């Protein structure tokens, strides 16, 4: 139910900060406008569901996702600078995603 969820812990095991990344919040000119990216993906998927050939409605989604992991790179290279931390990534060579 979240494309990518972020928690950042202390040296001792406290949840310093937790939130979801279904809502990349663009921060322009002081006034912030949040732009969802899960509702968008759900709409595009329901669009694929009734498109009768989905060779071009299956490329659009493979591009939107790869256009959503280029606006989370910033919300991560923001945390890293803000906390001087390390990052923890699942190693895909040994995973069984459901």
């Amino acid at each position: 139910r979240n494309l990518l969820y972020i928690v950042v812990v202390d040296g001792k095991g406290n949840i310093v900060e937790q939130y979801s990344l279904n809502e990349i919040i663009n921060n322009f000119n002081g006034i912030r406008i949040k732009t969802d990216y899960h509702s968008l993906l759900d709409k595009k998927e329901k669009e694929r569901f009734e498109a009768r050939q989905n060779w071009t409605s299956i490329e659009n989604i493979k591009e939107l996702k790869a256009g959503y992991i280029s606006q989370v790179v910033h919300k991560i290279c923001e945390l890293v600078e803000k906390y001087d931390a390390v990052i923890a990534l699942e190693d895909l060579n040994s995973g069984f995603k459901n």
Binding site: I33, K34, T35, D36
Partner: protein, 49 residues
């Protein structure tokens, strides 16, 4: 500046009989619901592609 730049050209791939455009002053709609302002009216043209 690691030298050795180049200069490319690419022709116009769209035929000028195909262009599509929101005309001037036509109140367009906005796709992202969180944005409160639900329309927009530019005073010129928005040539798609």
């Amino acid at each position: 500046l690691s030298g050795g730049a180049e200069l490319f050209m690419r022709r116009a791939s769209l035929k000028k009989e195909e262009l599509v455009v929101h005309p001037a002053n036509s109140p367009i709609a906005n796709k992202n619901p969180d944005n409160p302002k639900k329309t927009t009216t530019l005073s010129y043209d928005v040539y798609k592609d």
